[PDB]
Design a protein around this motif. Structure first.
Motif, PDB file in Angstrom:
ATOM      1  N   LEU A 155       0.823  -1.198   0.000  1.00  0.00           N
ATOM      2  CA  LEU A 155       0.000   0.000   0.000  1.00  0.00           C
ATOM      3  C   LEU A 155       0.861   1.253   0.000  1.00  0.00           C
ATOM      4  O   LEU A 155       2.065   1.196   0.266  1.00  0.00           O
ATOM      5  N   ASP A 156       0.227   2.380  -0.304  1.00  0.00           N
ATOM      6  CA  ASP A 156       0.920   3.652  -0.325  1.00  0.00           C
ATOM      7  C   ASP A 156       1.236   4.111   1.097  1.00  0.00           C
ATOM      8  O   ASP A 156       0.586   3.683   2.054  1.00  0.00           O
ATOM      9  N   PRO A 157       2.237   4.973   1.259  1.00  0.00           N
ATOM     10  CA  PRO A 157       2.590   5.469   2.592  1.00  0.00           C
ATOM     11  C   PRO A 157       1.416   6.110   3.317  1.00  0.00           C
ATOM     12  O   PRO A 157       1.283   5.918   4.535  1.00  0.00           O
ATOM     13  N   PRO A 158       0.545   6.879   2.645  1.00  0.00           N
ATOM     14  CA  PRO A 158      -0.599   7.456   3.374  1.00  0.00           C
ATOM     15  C   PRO A 158      -1.484   6.428   4.059  1.00  0.00           C
ATOM     16  O   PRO A 158      -1.920   6.668   5.190  1.00  0.00           O
ATOM     17  N   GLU A 159      -1.753   5.292   3.422  1.00  0.00           N
ATOM     18  CA  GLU A 159      -2.563   4.236   4.012  1.00  0.00           C
ATOM     19  C   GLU A 159      -1.784   3.366   4.983  1.00  0.00           C
ATOM     20  O   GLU A 159      -2.322   2.972   6.031  1.00  0.00           O
ATOM     21  N   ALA A 160      -0.533   3.060   4.639  1.00  0.00           N
ATOM     22  CA  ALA A 160       0.337   2.348   5.557  1.00  0.00           C
ATOM     23  C   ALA A 160       0.445   3.087   6.878  1.00  0.00           C
ATOM     24  O   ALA A 160       0.562   2.464   7.934  1.00  0.00           O
ATOM     25  N   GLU A 161       0.389   4.420   6.842  1.00  0.00           N
ATOM     26  CA  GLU A 161       0.434   5.174   8.087  1.00  0.00           C
ATOM     27  C   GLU A 161      -0.725   4.812   9.001  1.00  0.00           C
ATOM     28  O   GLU A 161      -0.511   4.535  10.183  1.00  0.00           O
ATOM     29  N   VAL A 162      -1.946   4.774   8.471  1.00  0.00           N
ATOM     30  CA  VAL A 162      -3.103   4.446   9.299  1.00  0.00           C
ATOM     31  C   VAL A 162      -3.010   3.012   9.805  1.00  0.00           C
ATOM     32  O   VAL A 162      -3.260   2.728  10.988  1.00  0.00           O
TER      33      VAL A 162
END
Lengths: 49, 49
Positions: free
Chosen positions: A4-11
């Motif tokens: 996944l992208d970093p924005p979603e991996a963050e959550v």
């Protein structure tokens, strides 16, 4: 991390971190209480000795 | 502290690509924004111009 992208991996990683550190705090609190119990027992043992 | 005004012109179909955590030809090879970007984005058609 690898799908996944970093924005979603963050959550996602945020949820995992919250859960895991909550588990650590639970474990530490249990250890503190059990250690208090053991200390009481050790004081009794020393008095008997 | 300061204001950075960045100006360009692109087709309307790519307007959505200008935001934190975006993907696309514009987002990867043309203009990249940080995930923690703070500030405003403004766009208006200029077909007459």
């Amino acid at each position: 991390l690898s799908r996944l992208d970093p924005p979603e991996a963050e959550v996602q990683i945020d949820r995992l971190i919250t859960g895991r550190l909550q588990s650590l705090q639970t474990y530490v609190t249990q250890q503190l209480i059990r250690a208090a119990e053991i200390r009481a027992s050790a004081n009794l043992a020393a008095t008997k000795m | 502290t300061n204001v950075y005004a960045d100006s360009f012109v692109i087709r309307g179909d790519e307007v959505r690509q200008i935001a934190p955590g975006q993907t696309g030809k514009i987002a990867d090879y043309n203009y990249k924004l940080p995930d923690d970007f703070t500030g405003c984005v403004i766009a208006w058609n200029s077909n007459n111009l």
